[PDB]
Symmetry: C3
Subunit: 265 residues, 3 copies
């Protein structure tokens, strides 16, 4: 048929796959933002969450773990800390217009990589039938937190497998349908974004909603984290020549499997 | 070697002279090879053309299919049991087209391939029995590869080809009369973004695509609408790299380079 | 910091003023370090020159060896139990040439290092006991690193260095009187393809190779014909990077950059 690989690829994307990065969140009514820990959705995409909320989109958190391990305060146990972080998360998400939060309650530092966790995410996908799903990019270089890696892998896997009636089939038996339905997966916390949201306007709000997680951001930690977080927003922004941005990686569904030229988007 | 001037000269001496490495004709003396696939259809999809060419050269090509394909349908009235039974039929006939001897079915459930000592011992049992001169398997470093059965197959293949050579590894194999693996001239990895050896499959493409469609349960008309162009686009990606129309890609490296090597990108 | 104009300015200030990240003399002040190796011989192969230099300045080098090297022989008359007892002695001898000191043996089996909270807890206990100023471990992101003990040592060492600081993590340690890991100034990854700090080991190269060859079970004469050139070439790859003949490379980054950082390649 076509002459060159470049023609083949271009036709693949453009016409066969209909890939469009100008407004990929344009028709979404319901989205899941999957975070490994309480606070990750806000650090990694809180500005974008605000913009979706404001636009009439329903934003639903699925938080994989409970934040149990995240303090050096020897007077605060993991149980007490987890209770405090659910409150932190609830308030921080109100500020961003966040509706609802599914807490999976795996212990922080202990998120399994297993069929079980896939079934939990699958149950939620089948219940809520979102149009889109956000999750950390499991390929981020030097990402040393297993909760992060595992979340990203489990999300992408679950978005696929929830579509298969023979996978976690008990779901169907109790009246759920397979996942439809979703228009997309977008990965945040990524080195290779190919879609950037300007949040220059929302950066102060984002910084405030982050700070609401006070257990995680006492004064002396913020002396480092605020510069760090502005510098990351500047990394993403510069890619589209704005001051503060949030970066997403989006790809056709086909590309997450056996594709040797994924770097061409 | 202690006298060699520069790193660049050392690397070329190491690669060519000490390791005797070159990609002129990697499949040269092979009488027998294993093709390790995660799911029924991966062998034909990643390397069907090469399989036919090896068959044509009188190489015994043997499949190892890690999983049963149980999950791969959206048809709500087809159980995974029934689908597995189907996909085995489909693979047997697909393989027949490519002159394929024999298939080992490991029978792990699709989406549930373990990454464990147990599965390496299964692969080792086969490598010690068959004593193949080469083993093909997916590159588990494929960027954005998001199927755990694919990544796990590839890492398990590579580890097994090494560990199956150690007599204290799965030692009961030896206690029942199997020898440690050797024979093995090579490992080659398909479904790869960094191929260094390309096989021209130009006038095999139509046979390759036919052998893929024999997996009907996977490739109905509406799926084929997208997948035929996709499969053509991939083969052109590889084919272009050596200036032919359609190709299949493999990454092949000295044995040493699968461990502590900081310059694997030079090949 | 609200006012800076460019990403490039923000990043320079972040690194130099906020994090005071310095790659000029990263081991300057260290009095005690841990070198974490998947198998016996990996400290010396990966960083023996460096270990000797640290020992020369009076730094106390402590090994933590994750496995017992049980599987690493092709000799059918040597069992894994006998091999592991030999390798323990070979490592004591190798380490004594480099000025080490003390070895912690985790004793997991070679090819079966778990990736789990348990192994994190073993490392966390050493860290809390020893309170080292610096920790060395393989780079688990090395391209094509196909030995699972290696990827898992690297991941677990980085995880443990962070989690051993958290009092709710493996809390029984503190209940027996250990404090959280307090002391470290640094993590350094060896066996790396993206080193950003190189120790010149030109003078030490021959000591390194001698202390490697003391692991005789691993390096008989026919293996050493391939391994000596491999090792020299690897050292020259690192060396060239600072204009010397032979070097050892490390990747060293600010602690923040091991998490959620999209610009790790700017160091
Ligand atoms: C920005 P984050 O991913 O939420 N920070 C996490 C925190 O949630 C977690 O409790 C802790 C212990 O695992 O590791 C920290 O690095
Ligand atoms: C080209 P393939 O790798 O074999 N197609 C697989 C199919 O085999 C499998 O049953 C399904 C569920 O795991 O995932 C699909 O992604
Ligand atoms: C240089 P090394 O990392 O120490 N060599 C290891 C050796 O220690 C181990 O016993 C064997 C079996 O796992 O695999 C070899 O690849
Ligand atoms: Zn997190
Ligand atoms: Zn497959
Ligand atoms: Zn090792």
């Amino acid at each position: 048929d076509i002459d060159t690989f470049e023609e083949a690829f271009n036709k693949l994307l453009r016409e066969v796959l209909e890939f469009d990065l100008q407004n990929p969140f344009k028709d979404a009514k319901k989205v899941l933002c999957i975070e490994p820990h309480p606070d990750d959705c806000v650090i990694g995409m809180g500005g974008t969450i605000k913009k979706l909320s404001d636009m009439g989109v329903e934003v639903i958190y699925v938080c994989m773990t409970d934040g149990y391990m995240g303090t050096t305060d020897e007077s605060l146990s993991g149980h007490e800390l987890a209770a405090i972080r659910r409150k932190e998360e609830e308030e921080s998400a109100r500020l961003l217009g966040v509706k609802k939060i599914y807490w999976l309650n795996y212990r922080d530092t202990e998120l399994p990589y297993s069929r079980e966790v896939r079934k939990d995410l699958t149950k939620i996908l089948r219940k809520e039938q979102p149009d889109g799903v956000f999750a950390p990019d499991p390929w981020l270089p030097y990402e040393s937190h297993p909760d992060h890696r595992r979340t990203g892998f489990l999300a992408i896997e679950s978005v696929a497998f929830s579509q298969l009636p023979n996978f976690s089939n008990t779901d169907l038996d109790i009246g759920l349908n397979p996942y439809n339905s979703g228009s997309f997966i977008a990965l945040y916390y990524t080195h290779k974004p190919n879609y950037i949201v300007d949040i220059t306007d929302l950066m102060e709000l984002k910084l405030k909603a982050i700070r609401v997680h006070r257990s995680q951001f006492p004064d002396d930690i913020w002396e480092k984290w605020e510069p760090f977080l502005r510098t990351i927003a500047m990394f993403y922004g510069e890619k589209i020549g704005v001051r503060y941005g949030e970066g997403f990686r989006i790809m056709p569904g086909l590309f997450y499997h056996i594709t040797p030229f994924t770097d061409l988007i």
